[PDB]
C-alpha cells in the first residue's frame, strides 16, 4: 500500500504533515505529534471531521484520503 499524506493542524493553526498507510494505527501519529508539541498525548484530542480519532483507528476505518485534515484540540 501507499502512504497517504495528512495535514495535522494544531490549536495555534500551525501545520504538520504526517504520512501513514491505510492500515496504520493512528496512535503512532498521535504520539509523534504530541512529542513534537512537547505535551502529553493524553492532554490532546485528535479530531477527523469533528470526530474523535481513537488510538487504534486507521485511515481505512475513518475513510481518510490524501490531503485529509486532522485537527488537534485540548482534551
Amino acid at each position: 500500500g501507499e502512504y497517504i499524506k495528512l495535514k495535522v493542524i494544531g490549536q495555534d493553526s500551525s501545520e504538520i504533515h504526517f504520512k501513514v498507510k491505510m492500515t496504520t494505527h493512528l496512535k503512532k501519529l498521535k504520539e509523534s505529534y504530541a512529542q513534537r508539541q512537547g505535551v502529553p498525548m493524553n492532554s490532546l484530542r485528535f479530531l477527523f471531521e469533528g470526530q474523535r480519532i481513537a488510538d487504534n483507528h486507521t485511515p481505512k476505518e475513518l475513510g481518510m484520503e490524501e490531503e485529509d485534515v486532522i485537527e488537534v484540540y485540548q482534551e
Binding site: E2, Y3, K5, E15, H17, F18, K19, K28, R36
Partner: peptide, 15 residues
Amino acid sequence: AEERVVVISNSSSRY
C-alpha cells in the same frame, strides 16, 4: 514556517 512532513512507519517516500 517551512513545510514539515513526518513519515509514520525519507519524507518523499510513498512506500
